[PDB]
Paper text:
While we purified and crystallized the protein in the absence of externally added ligands, short peptides were found to be associated with YejASm. The structure of YejASm with bound peptides was determined at a 1.58-Å resolution. YejASm adopts a fold consisting of two lobes, each formed by a central β-sheet flanked by α-helices connected with two short segments serving as hinges. SBPs exist in either open (apo) or closed (ligand-bound) conformations. In our structure, YejASm adopts a closed conformation due to the binding of fortuitous oligopeptides at the interface between the two lobes. Although the YejASm crystal structure corresponds to the full-length protein without signs of degradation, the bound oligopeptides could originate from YejASm degradation and/or peptides from E. coli during overexpression. A dipeptide (SS) and a pentapeptide (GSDVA) were built, guided by the electron density at different places in the closed interface. Electron density linking the two peptides was missing, emphasizing that a population of different peptides might have bound to the peptide-binding site. Consequently, the resultant crystal structure of YejASm is an average of different peptides in the crystal lattice. The binding of the pentapeptide to YejASm is almost exclusively due to hydrogen bond formation between the peptide backbone and the protein (10 interactions out of 12), and that of the dipeptide is only via its backbone, meaning that the binding is unspecific.
Author numbering:
A (entry chain A): 0 to 589
B (entry chain B): 2 to 6
Write the structure that this text describes.
Amino acid sequence: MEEQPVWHHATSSIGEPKYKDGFARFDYVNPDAPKGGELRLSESGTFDSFNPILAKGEVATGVSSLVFETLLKSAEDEITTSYGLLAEGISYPDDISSATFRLRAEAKWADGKPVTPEDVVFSFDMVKEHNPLFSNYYRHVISAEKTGERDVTFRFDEKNNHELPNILGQFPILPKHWWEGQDAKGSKRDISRTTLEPVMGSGPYKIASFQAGGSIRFELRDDYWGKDLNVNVGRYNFRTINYAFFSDRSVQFEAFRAGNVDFYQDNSASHWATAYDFPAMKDGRVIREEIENPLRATGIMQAFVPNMRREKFKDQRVRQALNYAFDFEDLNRSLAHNAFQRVDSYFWGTELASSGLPEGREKEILEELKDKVPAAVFTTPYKNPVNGDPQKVRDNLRKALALFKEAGYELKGSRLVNAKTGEPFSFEILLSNPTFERTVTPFVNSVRKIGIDARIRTVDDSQYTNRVRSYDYDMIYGIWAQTLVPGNEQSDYWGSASVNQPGSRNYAGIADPAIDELIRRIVFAPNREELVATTRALDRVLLAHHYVVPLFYSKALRVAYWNHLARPKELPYYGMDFPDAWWSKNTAAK
Amino acid sequence: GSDVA
Ligand SMILES: [Mg+2]
Ligand SMILES: [Mg+2]
């Protein structure tokens, strides 16, 4: 039966919330951070829409982060804990069959109207209708309904989906009266379409001005309802946050070297080692940091991702052969200044990574699926090829050719061809920017040695997003990041239902009954021990199918910034909270 | 984001 409700100020999918009800602020912030000053940021690519939820066009990241808010705010000094932001509290029955959020009486839109349950209901229905990521994420949430003056209740299709109250705190809340209203031209607004009309939110910043496709100026609102709320103390300090968009990374970095961009996150090991020979780098005007914080408690798979919707990549032997052709040792040494570590798990860098042979509960879970998983899961620990020397490079290429021969492809006149049709084995690697070319060219050169015509096709970010949405590629240089609590998002990465649905993150086109069963077991995991064992079992099965060519990664974010930006003395353990917890030194100096 | 050489 139902019992007297228990209200919570926070939710956690792992452990207990660090902060008690009534806490004043997060520990890491500077409570006296001054309000003021300009922060100049850069963003790759462009934008052509301010619609924060429609998965169409190109939207600036600052819109959802600075103008809109969610029901709960995730603490960057904890793993999954979230605290009441637009919601004052959360209540749910023990069986997790529903979840109710009580909205804060003080929460207001920038136009002064209250944030209401009607807004939450509209936002929920709209994210599910217009955004494939949230459509999947909330697939087990049947409905949202107003159940009180300030209450929204979400109902679930099945009990014991433990993370649902937590993940429901992550979607932006949009103003129903505004989206169902009329613009200045007298035209009804439409959430189903892109827009360049500056959108209105409940967040700390408003869109003050913009140059479509080129820049956006966000301005801090002194009337932001949540300015003094515990999760916001010492946060949202810059008066103005300008974003300038760049399609050329070198032009973007030149803007940083000129002091026209204040902060730069460097994703290239060679650029980090060589591009900083400029005067401001020598006299303390620019600071460089290698920050591990945002990558702690994060699993990473970065890979060459073949598209299994295409006949050329359907054979596991072909996909395995491509790994034998990739030489990581040479790439790391000759081009990457030895900066990287080879990835060997979809949950690499966490306790969720499978290792060795399956044991205990992990082995038991796989045993109930023995007729449906690769035989290798019980006999063969996953390993990548290693190219310690030139004879080994040739031997690994011989192994690639052997796998291709088993798959029906043979060298004819030093070109790898389909043995029955004569059609050459060829593929295109789609890249989003020329900055990826130097990393990918060695792989192209390696497969060319065994008769494969691989070609790079570099496009711009707008074309890239449009092609990836429709899976219009043979292969991409892809990435999937994971938390320590796998859940409802997993079906967006490897679930069968996402293969033929545009806009999913199932880039390889994986469709497998055993994987689907493991994803279901993760979602409905009764406890942490069962979740960990099931996740390692899923990782082991994914790896044994050789769906991708795992690449590499590092354990720290490389950032450089101008010394007029101030950061908290100690960054939150699991993040940087940039730019929200940072502030202007020009302002502090009056 | 993606890390490169
Ligand atoms: Mg973008
Ligand atoms: Mg933020």
